[PDB]
């Protein structure tokens, strides 16, 4: 069996090849206690990684080692991987090959250090790096379409006509779930609620995951919320207070289709899909239109599939038909696709052997993997 580790900006999923679900799913945060230890009865470890830090997030400064799909702090990333293999998966990496995932259009040094760490710290027999969006299409049982992935750091549209992705038509935007969380707490102060610290940031993410939804018609829905009631929902904070949010339910997800609210000149998630398709061949455009696939946790809002279909239809010519595919398990689509790829018999020749890395150093990751 081959371990399939899908490191993500917000959460990382690890498991085994051939399984239908990740074995361990924990947040990718490393926290350190800012206060001074006063008691000596307990261990009081230097740092906490994963769900251990989430439980004690009150007294820790949570820091994300990955930002926009780029590993900013390699000292904390080694802590997370050491926690995945020895505490969650409880397996020895020295016996099983490891499959990793990297976002497209990333710095070459990001995946070069990944190879160096795997082959020098954990001594894995083999390794491989695959595009996150490409694996999302395999989980849906397709080999021809456009994948609209969206997580915490990256929202990339990768049109995949065949088993290999099209490199020249890949569009990547730095607007994802984490950006919306910072916008949600900015407009939450309008109602009198102030969430500033990183510990309070995790509270906002819970509100976004449960109450936020995408409105079919933003202009019409804003007028409806102006009449008060029938739209305000109550959420209970860990302290105990009950907060009510009105038009903020659909305003935060609306930043996806209108990035001008965040002060970014980039186009919305609906136009960036149409722009990506326009960069492909005329013959292939028919297949990509009818095989659009969503993935990632950001696209799990109630009604995003319905809203996306309407926006693309207006931009696309009326002759073409638009069919947005939203699988029920699109949150774990990246990992599930990787499980299928690892279990394939043909993939056994694509592994990077330990001897191969030694002869060429870390630079072999660019030439072999894609």
């Amino acid at each position: 069996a081959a371990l399939v580790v899908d490191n993500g900006s917000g959460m990382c999923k690890a498991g085994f090849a051939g399984d239908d679900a990740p074995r361990a799913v924990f947040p990718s945060i490393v926290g350190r206690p800012r206060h001074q230890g006063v008691m000596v009865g307990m261990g009081q470890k230097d740092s906490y990684v994963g769900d251990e830090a989430q439980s004690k997030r009150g007294i820790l400064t949570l820091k994300y080692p990955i930002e926009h799909g780029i590993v900013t702090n390699w000292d904390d990333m080694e802590k997370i991987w050491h926690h995945t293999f020895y505490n969650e998966l409880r397996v020895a990496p020295e016996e099983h090959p490891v499959l990793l995932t990297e976002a497209p259009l990333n710095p070459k040094a990001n995946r070069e250090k990944m190879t160096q760490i795997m082959f020098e710290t954990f001594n894995t027999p083999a390794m491989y790096v695959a595009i996150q969006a490409v694996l999302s299409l395999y989980a849906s049982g397709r080999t021809t379409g456009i994948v609209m992935d969206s997580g915490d750091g990256v929202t990339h549209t990768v049109p995949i006509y065949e088993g290999y992705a099209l490199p020249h038509a890949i569009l990547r935007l730095d607007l994802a779930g984490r950006d919306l969380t910072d916008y949600l707490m900015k407009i939450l102060t309008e109602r009198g609620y102030s969430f500033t610290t990183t510990a309070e940031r995790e509270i906002v993410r819970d509100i976004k995951e449960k109450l936020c939804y995408v409105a079919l018609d933003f202009e019409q829905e804003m007028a409806t919320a102006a009449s008060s009631s029938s739209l305000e929902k109550s959420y209970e904070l860990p302290d105990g207070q009950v907060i009510t949010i009105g038009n903020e339910r659909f305003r935060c997800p609306e930043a996806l289709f209108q990035p001008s609210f965040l002060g970014m000149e980039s186009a919305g998630i609906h136009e960036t899909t149409f722009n990506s398709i326009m960069k492909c061949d005329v013959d292939i455009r028919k297949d990509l239109y009818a095989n659009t696939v969503l993935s990632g946790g950001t696209t799990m809002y109630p009604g995003i599939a319905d809203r996306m279909q309407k926006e693309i239809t207006a931009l696309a010519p009326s002759t073409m038909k638009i069919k947005i595919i939203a699988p029920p398990e699109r949150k774990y689509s990246v990992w599930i696709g990787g499980s299928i790829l690892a279990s394939l018999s043909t993939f056994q020749q694509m592994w990077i052997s330990k001897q191969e890395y030694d002869e060429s150093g870390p630079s072999i990751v660019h030439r072999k993997c894609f």
Binding site: T189, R191, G192, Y193, S194, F195, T196, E200, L237, D239, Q241, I243
Partner: peptide, 7 residues
């Protein structure tokens, strides 16, 4: 404030 801080 209402939720968060004292104001």
């Amino acid at each position: 404030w209402x939720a968060x801080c004292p104001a």
